[model samples]
Target: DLENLYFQGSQINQVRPKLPLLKILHAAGAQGEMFTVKEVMHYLGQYIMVKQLYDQQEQHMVYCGGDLLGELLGRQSFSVKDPSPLYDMLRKNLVT
Candidate 1:
């Protein structure tokens, strides 16, 4: 059974962050928190900003600060111009 909320919050689509991704969330005192896929993506975006992991290149490239991020993203860099790609990578870390 699951709850339902979006545009606000959604439990119907709620997912637990897997261990690798959970570590990142835990780093920000988010241990044991449940999140919607949408919420998780927003959190990931903020986490990157907080870590200042974006590259200094002309195009939008997010830098992977650690092997953890690099490996999960399947590369050392990713494009913010199309967040869909990043979301696809990130979706793997969500468990419904």
Candidate 2:
């Protein structure tokens, strides 16, 4: 009996978010959506881009500065290239 895994069309995997992240996801969409980290990253990218949240002078960095994103991703600056700290936030907010 090897019933330990499943795949579903390479889509809609899971890494369910807690309330904090859920708040942000709601800004993106869906009340009961499943998400992969990459999928969430894409939506976050769109949100950041739409809100013009990146640091203008630095170009490669983002400005957190007390925004809603700051609640999920602390009120500090980080680079667009590396987001290792994101893993920490994800860990803190993961429902699984």
Candidate 3:
């Protein structure tokens, strides 16, 4: 539903999802060490459409709002060997 709404038209607006957040957390938790930021970004990019709008003044397309998860992960320190920090951050942000 959210995905459909987000990618329905060219006149895009900034938006995000709630259920997909839980799904992403579950997926990342399930993957454990196999999980990578690239996977996460790709997952979100597929389901959560980014806001695409053309700036008339700049005469270029601008994208936004699809990288919230990526940005959130970027703020933390984690590696494939030890993703506990990422899990902890997700729990803190998602649960609380």
Candidate 4:
């Protein structure tokens, strides 16, 4: 048997739907095209060094990554604003 959970606004938490970005990344990964750290850095570099054509998209991608890393690392690290090193370590472990 399954149960339903609700949050602050009493919004019903339906669990079947997959998030769009996650769906996109999943499709990409299935084709062996998932993002890598170097590519992540490249995206960050583009957003930081240039504020035109690539900025918004790059920032969105980076935001997604940071959010993800923050989730895995949890509240304390995110609250203190130091998730990169933890993310790096986890990423390395994933590779090996």
**Candidate 1 vs candidate 4, lDDT winner:** 1
Q: Which candidate is the best by lDDT?
A: 2
lDDT of 2 at 46: 70
Question: How does candidate 3 score on lDDT?
Answer: 0.41
Q: Rank the candidates by TM-score, best first.
A: 2, 1, 3, 4
Model 2 lDDT vs. the true structure? 0.72
User: CA shift at 46, candidate 4, in angstroms?
Assistant: 8.5
Those runs of model 3 whose alpha carbons end farther than 4 Å from true positions after fitting are 1-66
Residue 70, candidate 4: C-alpha displacement in angstroms = 1.7
Q: Which candidate is the best by TM-score?
A: 2
lDDT of 2 by residue, 1-94 (tens): 2343444343455778787777777776635656787777777777677768887777778886687787777757678688876777888886
Q: List the residue pairs that clash in candidate 4.
A: none
TM-score per prediction, in order, is 0.70, 0.72, 0.25, 0.25
Model 4, C-alpha of 85: deviation from truth (Å): 3.5
The better-scoring model by lDDT among 1 and 2 is 2
Q: Point out the worst 10-residue segment of candidate 3 by lDDT.
A: 47-56
Predictions in order: lDDT: 0.70, 0.72, 0.41, 0.35
User: Sorted on lDDT, highest at the top, how do the candidates line up?
Assistant: 2, 1, 3, 4
Model 1 TM-score is: 0.70
